[PDB]
Amino acid sequence: SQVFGVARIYASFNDTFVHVTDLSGKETIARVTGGMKVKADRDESSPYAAMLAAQDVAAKCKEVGITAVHVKIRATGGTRTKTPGPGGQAALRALARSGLRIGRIEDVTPVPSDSTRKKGGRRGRRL
Amino acid sequence: AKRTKKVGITGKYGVRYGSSLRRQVKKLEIQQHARYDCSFCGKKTVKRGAAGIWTCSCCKKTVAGGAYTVSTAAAATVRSTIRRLREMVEA
């Protein structure tokens, strides 16, 4: 009854991606980011920008024919953050409110069994 | 008795060519003239002919090797890689 895709919310810091794709992931549908919705070079990670981007992506999904999305949330991961940005939460809520059905929430943040040497030097960013 | 303190094989070169170059030549000449264990007959009878050729005085087997040593690290790594790929292909 429902057509399932994948939601693929990448909430980094400084920006957020809402990437709706097919079940396989090869074919993409309306990848829209908060940088496409606001123009300040600093607000890409704003929850308002994330909500606007998610609303546009969900509208395009409903016009293409997608009814529900299996949600995969991820952060920058690797060696950098492992913590979702502020905008992924707003993106998920906006996708839920824009009429799309939501299924199978999953965190796919890339977590190493151990890392390459982290950026910043041993003493880190000294601000 | 010990005849030279540090020059060793390069004592034939006298004071010429510089200490650093004589040191490098010492290292590679020692490798080149060392006697090696035969992988087939189990004896320490493998010596270099020309560069890259290592012949065993017993059992007369000849093996292609490095210029100054029987097996280079590159060839050891290549042997390991080819063994892994071969095991993957046949398994």
Binding site: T83, E106, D107, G124 | -
Partner: protein, 97 residues
Amino acid sequence: PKKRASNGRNKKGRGHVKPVRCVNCSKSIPKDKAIKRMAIRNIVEAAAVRDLSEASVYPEYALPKTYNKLHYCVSCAIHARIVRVRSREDRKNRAPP
């Protein structure tokens, strides 16, 4: 003098402990000395658990949690208020709040 009875870390009988990187500034800190806080936070709260439940296609999904162990250097922990400066007598209280 010596501020802390054992040390500003937890290492007795070892000599060396492998370091960990601060999540906030990337400073290199030994694993024992780093301030480690575990986060089991619900993956979607957003004051919107009921909203996601309404939008869901599965009845009683039982949404997951996101797990993340954060390691902080002393400076970053103090600045971000994971830990606070305590009095001489309060420093000796290892129990969590």
